[PDB]
Amino acid sequence: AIEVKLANMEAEINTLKSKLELTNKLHAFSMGKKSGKKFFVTNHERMPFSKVKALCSELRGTVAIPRNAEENKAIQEVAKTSAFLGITDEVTEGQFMYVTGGRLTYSNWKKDQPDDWYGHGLGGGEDCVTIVDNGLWNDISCQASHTAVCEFPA
Amino acid sequence: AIEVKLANMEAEINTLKSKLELTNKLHAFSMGKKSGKKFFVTNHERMPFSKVKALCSELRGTVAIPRNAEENKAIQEVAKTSAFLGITDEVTEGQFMYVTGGRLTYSNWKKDQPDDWYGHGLGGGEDCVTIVDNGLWNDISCQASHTAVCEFPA
Amino acid sequence: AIEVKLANMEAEINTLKSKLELTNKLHAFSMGKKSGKKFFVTNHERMPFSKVKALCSELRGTVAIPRNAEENKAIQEVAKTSAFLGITDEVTEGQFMYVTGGRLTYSNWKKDQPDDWYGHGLGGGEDCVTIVDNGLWNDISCQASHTAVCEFPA
Numbered sequence: 001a002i003e004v005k006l007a008n009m010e011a012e013i014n015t016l017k018s019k020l021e022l023t024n025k026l027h028a029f030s031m032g033k034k035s036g037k038k039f040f041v042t043n044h045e046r047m048p049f050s051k052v053k054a055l056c057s058e059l060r061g062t063v064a065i066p067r068n069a070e071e072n073k074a075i076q077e078v079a080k081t082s083a084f085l086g087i088t089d090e091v092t093e094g095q096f097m098y099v100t101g102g103r104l105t106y107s108n109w110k111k112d113q114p115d116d117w118y119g120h121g122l123g124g125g126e127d128c129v130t131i132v133d134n135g136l137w138n139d140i141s142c143q144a145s146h147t148a149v150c151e152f153p154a
Numbered sequence: 155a156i157e158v159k160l161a162n163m164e165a166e167i168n169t170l171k172s173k174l175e176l177t178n179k180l181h182a183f184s185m186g187k188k189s190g191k192k193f194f195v196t197n198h199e200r201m202p203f204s205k206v207k208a209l210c211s212e213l214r215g216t217v218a219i220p221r222n223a224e225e226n227k228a229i230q231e232v233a234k235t236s237a238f239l240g241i242t243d244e245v246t247e248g249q250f251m252y253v254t255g256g257r258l259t260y261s262n263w264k265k266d267q268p269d270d271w272y273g274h275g276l277g278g279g280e281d282c283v284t285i286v287d288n289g290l291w292n293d294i295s296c297q298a299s300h301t302a303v304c305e306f307p308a
Numbered sequence: 309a310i311e312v313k314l315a316n317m318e319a320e321i322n323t324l325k326s327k328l329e330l331t332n333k334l335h336a337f338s339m340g341k342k343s344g345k346k347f348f349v350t351n352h353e354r355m356p357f358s359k360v361k362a363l364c365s366e367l368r369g370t371v372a373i374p375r376n377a378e379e380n381k382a383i384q385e386v387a388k389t390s391a392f393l394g395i396t397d398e399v400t401e402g403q404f405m406y407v408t409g410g411r412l413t414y415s416n417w418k419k420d421q422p423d424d425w426y427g428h429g430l431g432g433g434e435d436c437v438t439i440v441d442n443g444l445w446n447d448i449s450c451q452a453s454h455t456a457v458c459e460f461p462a
């Protein structure tokens with residue numbers, strides 16, 4: 001009895017894992033994941049950078065990071081408003097790095113940006129980055145509230 | 155063997171619980187759920203009130219109830235068309251209550267509503283409530299078919 | 309006692325399997341699945357017929373097939389843009405078959421369709437069926453890229 005039960009239990013668990021993986025694939029598909037491409041998702045909520053980071057982390061994702069034109073376009077299309085990207089220069093002013101470590105290899109800065117502007121009155125300059133409506137980038141205060149767009153691997 | 159196998163299964167089960175909780179969180183997020191706020195979902199199907207209640211019940215949710223202007227706005231945004239609300243005066247004519255129990259704490263009745271109208275010919279007056287496109291409320295027959303909008307906890 | 313722990317673990321597994329079924333029900337609901345009707349879904353990716361077949365298969369579904377006016381509208385609304393239907397006359401020209409087998413029963417052909425055009429510049433004629441934005445059917449090249457829409461049982 002005991003051993004047959006344990007073997008059935010291993011089989012129940014495995015079937016459950018298989019079904020959940022299928023559920024996850026279907027969910028990604030319905031959320032717009034393109035074959036073999038990393039995908040972006042948003043709840044359309046605006047919040048400070050630290051919150052987006054915390055939120056996406058809780059989802060086992062990361063704050064969206066465009067690595068090329070295609071991805072930048074994908075994020076632009078998903079967000080549809082100013083959205084934080086996983087890029088900051090908090091560690092060393094002027095040096096933008098991915099939250100996932102490493103210096104920028106692809107950029108799409110709007111003209112005259114980044115400018116580490118202080119005029120926002122929120123304190124400090126601008127150490128975070130957002131993708132604005134047309135896909136161009138702007139450095140903004142990490143304390144300002146923008147759309148949360150999380151990224152999941154290909 | 156046996157006890158080590160059983161101990162691994164506990165770990166396998168626990169890991170599955172966490173993964174499924176993650177899937178639910180991601181699904182809620184993709185469905186527009188805002189942090190710490192209840193969310194509304196619809197499949198855009200129109201059906202009588204009894205059907206909406208059974209449907210939301212099966213999904214472990216409840217028929218959408220606006221507790222304030224914000225939520226009322228969210229529900230109308232989700233439904234897009236006339237939808238039933240979890241409020242009726244079926245227990246005592248004239249006294250609208252939440253299906254979940256209790257008297258109304260917020261209302262957005264359109265002018266000259268509720269009127270417990272009989273002119274619809276479905277029999278009886280009007281004991282159910284629909285939120286019309288412009289966020290306003292109208293009492294309607296529970297037998298009429300309107301959009302099913304379910305609500306899930308904050 | 310091992311047996312007792314095993315019993316409790318079996319209970320946990322049952323709770324999890326019901327929880328996953330609920331997750332699947334909620335997702336289908338959020339994606340527009342009507343009660344007792346097939347479920348249609350898309351990731352809004354355009355690709356050749358071969359890829360749509362491959363993708364839907366990986367999800368354990370099939371390329372969307374309208375079998376009546378209702379399903380036709382349902383697919384049209386889901387895809388929003390030209391999508392492939394699981395119908396083709398690849399084998400024998402003029403004999404449209406379902407990817408799931410059998411000769412075409414219900415059809416919603418436009419006037420002058422199917423015409424098996426060749427001048428598209430893709431090689432061959434038109435052996436696939438796309439439900440154009442308007443809802444009507446039009447045969448097209450199975451090499452052209454159209455929206456991927458998969459269906460799942462009622």
Ligand SMILES: CO[C@@H]1O[C@H](CO)[C@H](O)[C@H](O)[C@H]1O
Pocket residue numbers: 113115117126138139140
């Ligand atoms: C009109 O956009 C704003 O311009 C400022 C400069 O004046 C800063 O660059 C801000 O970051 C940017 O949001």
Ligand SMILES: CO[C@@H]1O[C@H](CO)[C@H](O)[C@H](O)[C@H]1O
Pocket residue numbers: 267269271280292293294
């Ligand atoms: C034109 O709207 C209808 O008006 C009736 C009164 O004439 C009732 O109030 C119905 O509930 C309402 O839907």
Ligand SMILES: [Ca+2]
Pocket residue numbers: 012
């Ligand atoms: Ca079994």
Ligand SMILES: [Ca+2]
Pocket residue numbers: 089090093094116125126127128139
């Ligand atoms: Ca800076």
Ligand SMILES: [Ca+2]
Pocket residue numbers: 113114115116117126138139140
């Ligand atoms: Ca700036």
Ligand SMILES: [Ca+2]
Pocket residue numbers: 166
């Ligand atoms: Ca293992």
Ligand SMILES: [Ca+2]
Pocket residue numbers: 243247248270279280281282293
């Ligand atoms: Ca009444």
Ligand SMILES: [Ca+2]
Pocket residue numbers: 267268269270271280292293294
């Ligand atoms: Ca009325």
Ligand SMILES: [Ca+2]
Pocket residue numbers: 397398400401433434435
């Ligand atoms: Ca042919």
Ligand SMILES: [Ca+2]
Pocket residue numbers: 397401402424433434435436447
């Ligand atoms: Ca043909």
Ligand SMILES: [Ca+2]
Pocket residue numbers: 421422423424425434446447448
């Ligand atoms: Ca044609």
Ligand SMILES: [Cl-]
Pocket residue numbers: 124125126127128140141142143
């Ligand atoms: Cl900052």
Ligand SMILES: [Cl-]
Pocket residue numbers: 278279280281282294295296297
């Ligand atoms: Cl009624």
